[PDB]
Structures are given as C-alpha cells and as structure tokens.
A paper describes a structure:
To test this hypothesis, we generated a variant of HG3 that contains all HG3.17 mutations found within 7.5 Å of 6NT, with the exception of N47E, which we omitted to favor the formation of a unit cell similar to that of HG3. This yielded HG4, a variant of HG3 containing 8 mutations. Kinetic analysis of HG4 revealed that its catalytic efficiency is >700-fold higher than that of HG3, and equivalent to that of the average natural enzyme (~105 M−1 s−1). In HG3.17 and HG4 however, only Trp44 adopts a non-productive conformation in the unbound state, with an occupancy of 62% or 26%, respectively. f Cut-away view of the active site shows that its entrance (top) becomes widened during evolution, as indicated by an increasing bottleneck radius (reported as the average radius ± s.d. calculated using the highest occupancy conformers from both chain A and B, except for HG3.17, which contains a single chain). Crystallographic analysis of HG4 reveals that mutations proximal to the active site are sufficient to alter the conformational ensemble for the enrichment of catalytically competent sub-states. We expect that the structures reported here, especially those of HG4 and HG3, will be helpful to benchmark these future enzyme design protocols.
To evaluate changes to the HG3 conformational ensemble along its evolutionary trajectory, we solved room-temperature (277 K) X-ray crystal structures of all HG-series Kemp eliminases, both in the presence and absence of bound 6NT.
Numbering used by the authors: 4 to 303
The structure:
Amino acid sequence: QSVDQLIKARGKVYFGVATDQNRLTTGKNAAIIQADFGMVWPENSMQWDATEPSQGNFNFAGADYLVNWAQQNGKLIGAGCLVWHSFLPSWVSSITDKNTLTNVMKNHITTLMTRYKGKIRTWDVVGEAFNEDGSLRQTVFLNVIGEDYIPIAFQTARAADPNAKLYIMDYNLDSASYPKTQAIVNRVKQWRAAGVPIDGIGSQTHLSAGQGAGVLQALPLLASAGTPEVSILMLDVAGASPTDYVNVVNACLNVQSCVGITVMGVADPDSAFASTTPLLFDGNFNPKPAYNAIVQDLQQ
C-alpha cells in the first residue's frame, strides 16, 4: 500500500524520497517510487559542487534526468540546496570580495531556478546556516557578505521562480528544548517580519533510536515561526523502530502547516548510515515493519 496515497487522504501533500539517476536504473527503486511515493528529490545532482564546479559553467545532466523522470511519472519535485557550505567547491570558498561573492551566489541561484522554472514545488534555498548554540554558522557567506546573505538568497530565489515554495533547512531541530530549535524560530520570525520570502522550514530529521517522540513537541515549535509550511525531510531512524517512525508521522499529522515527509532513501544498503539499517525497505527491497506500521497509522 502507498504511504503517499494514504498521507494525501489525511490532507497532506506528499510522502517523498531522495533519489538520483543511478538509483532509478538499479535495484527496485524506480518501481517502489512509482507505486509508493509522491515526490522525488535529488540526493546529490543539484548540490553546488555537482552543478557549478567552476565559475559560471554549469553541469545539469544528472538533474535534468531526475526532473524528466519525475514529470514522466507524475511526481512532484523538490530540489536543493542552493546555498549549503557542505557542498561548496573550493573556488567559491576562496572568494573574499563581498560584491563578487554576492553576484556569484545570485548567479548560482538564478541559473538553477530559471532552468527548472515552474517545475519545482519546493526549493531548499539555504541549508545548515545555524550553529548548535543558535548563532549563525561562520561560513564563507557569513564571513564575506554578512548576515544579509540569507535575505539576499531568498529575495533572489523568489524573483527567479515565484511559483516555488522557498525553504530554509537545518538539522538537530528534533527537540523543543534544544537551543538551535528556538534560535531558528527567533530568526525566521524576524526575517519574515522584514519581508524576507521564507515559505518553509525544513527539518532534516536524522534520528537515533528513541528520538521520534521528541519531534511531537519540536515540530509544533518550528511551526510557531509562522511560515506557511514546515516539512520533515532527509528522514531516517537508526534501527528503524516502528515507534520512532510512527511518532514522526503523527507529528506531521498534528501540525496543520506540515505539508509532508521526505525519507533519505529507499533501501537500507543505499543509506550513508547502512549499518544502522535506518530506512523503510531492506536490502532485498522488502518493506520493513516500520513501513507497515506507518500504513496502519495513516488508516486508523
């Protein structure tokens, strides 16, 4: 049974998954995505180091394949991350002029978003901008441009494709008493009051065993920032306990503005954390107990 169809029946937009070309051509990934998921994200093919490995010169072969596949199969598309220190090529992190880096960042955003204009439901514009104590992470963008880089990125993105929902995303937003959770709420409220077009907060939900329960309180706190949408993305859970997965799903159902959930991958062996077997399908592409528990939870 399709978790995407069932979550849509409960009033949400999608249950999605991250993938890319060589997953769609191997294993049983394409068949599972076709049957069970409503939205696809590029795992790597839209990141900066994959799309702009040298200045002004873009690589789109991998991203084009995924966008075309999604359109042919009637799936929604999410994409990202436009500005994320973890996937920056060296040529960007060696720029020291504020004007130059601003133009480089705007060109990167505008080029990617224009190519797929109108085809992408959600863009992750800025990722992992916060330290664990809630201060802003001292990346090349903060050091060279200053805190204005976040407003600039979102303004540029809105102009490039007004149809897309624009998100900021971060991890370790899984507990309501963790300082980073309240910090992103504080800053997003301030940015939206200044007219910055942040449509969503995406919570990168990479969980250890037993941490699902905390999301029931953290996700409503994230929603208190007043963005139109929030989402769970990059979801995986060490051990893949049904209890942890059901708690995350119910957090989504309890938060009106939470539009859906994206899991990090299909089958355990293709996880970056494969030894923790943290996904919903096993190494033989069989649905795991957590998958069936989600199905039952969505039907009750």
